[PDB]
Design a protein around this nucleic acid. Sequence first.
DNA 1: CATATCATTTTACTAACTG
DNA 2: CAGTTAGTAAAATGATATG
Lengths: 104, 110, 105, 110
Amino acid sequence: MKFILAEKFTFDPLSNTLIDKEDSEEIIRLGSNESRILWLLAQRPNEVISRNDLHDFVWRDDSSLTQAISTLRKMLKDSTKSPQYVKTVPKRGYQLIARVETVE
Amino acid sequence: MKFILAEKFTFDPLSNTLIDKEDSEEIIRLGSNESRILWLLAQRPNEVISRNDLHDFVWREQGFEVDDSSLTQAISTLRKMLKDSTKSPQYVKTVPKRGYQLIARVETVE
Amino acid sequence: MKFILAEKFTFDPLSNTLIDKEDSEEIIRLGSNESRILWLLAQRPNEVISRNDLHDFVWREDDSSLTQAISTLRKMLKDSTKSPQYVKTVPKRGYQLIARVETVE
Amino acid sequence: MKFILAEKFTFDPLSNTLIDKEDSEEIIRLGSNESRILWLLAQRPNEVISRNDLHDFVWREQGFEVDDSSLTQAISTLRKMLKDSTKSPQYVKTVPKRGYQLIARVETVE
DNA sequence: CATATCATTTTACTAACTG
DNA sequence: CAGTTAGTAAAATGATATG
Ligand SMILES: [N+]
Ligand SMILES: [N+]
């Protein structure tokens, strides 16, 4: 499956890649951790996903989630101050607030 | 579920956001506490909701333990975000010994 | 002894009175508590005076009685709580008279 | 007495105030913690002052008990009030594991 | 006494630094 | 990068102000 995020990125969680519409010939290569976080977020779009859920989907020391979110925001060129993709929900987890569409 | 408050704010408790028709481009970012207070008030529009009911819905139901005064501080922050005058409220009225009351018009979208 | 506060008020702690130069014919009459608070602040100009000192100069050896008297005094001085010109609050330490203070006579 | 910092701010630690010569009418009001940090930094200008020294001067000597994190939060607020860039500081420099350092020019008035 | 606002402290999440 | 240290945002709480 692929996802369209905020009318901008095509995300393929199986190949761990992002493609920016504005730079269609450049493959953005996600680390496995960041790809799995974005996939779980996209599977439950606009839902707040607990740090526990995100954590358990990647690993079996909760600082690793925070760093993986920072890297993902960088690859998405998302602002921490003013997020357009991944929003932090203090004491609750993270929330994918971009428009999310599935293709194929 | 979305709410329209006083014919002015679009409230989304699932995103903790307020959009003011004056500046439809600027999102207003609500903290979870203020959003959950506004949500309970909007679910019971124009009813006086006890401090106890608000404390349980906002904090206890989330597994959070806080003193009573957290509600007062959060009400104060919420009024500031709504630019509601404490002396002459258009949105959130205090009823001493009884709680708080959303007196703005409330409509549900979905 | 009289004090001149911020080039504006003449303060007589002995008669518990304030006179505003902009309204020189009106006597502002202070309650004894507020007058003693102002007097002690004026005796230690621009010093932070502890809540304990202010309280003890007025009342017997609550606490909100000091807070209420400061509020009353700021109203008589037409002082802004948000932007003080006369009596400034020093959180966890007390209050501080920041107006220029002069003794006359 | 007072301090002139970086040829820009007049700092009075007895009044917890900053005056920016660019807006000589606008007093910048410092909290007591931020003012006591700046005061100790200015007493030892361009020296690296340990977190312990700062913690003792700002809180312990005043009779206040706080965690170490209070100093970091207070430094952050102080830099905001000075409009100091954390990435490229003009006023307060962090020296990891050693403390903080006032690198602005410091003069004593009177 | 109850509530409101401001300040301080602490916690939650984020970024920088060094073997 | 790994864990330690520091920075910023948010929450909780304490202090002071008002009704
Ligand atoms: N006492
Ligand atoms: N502080």
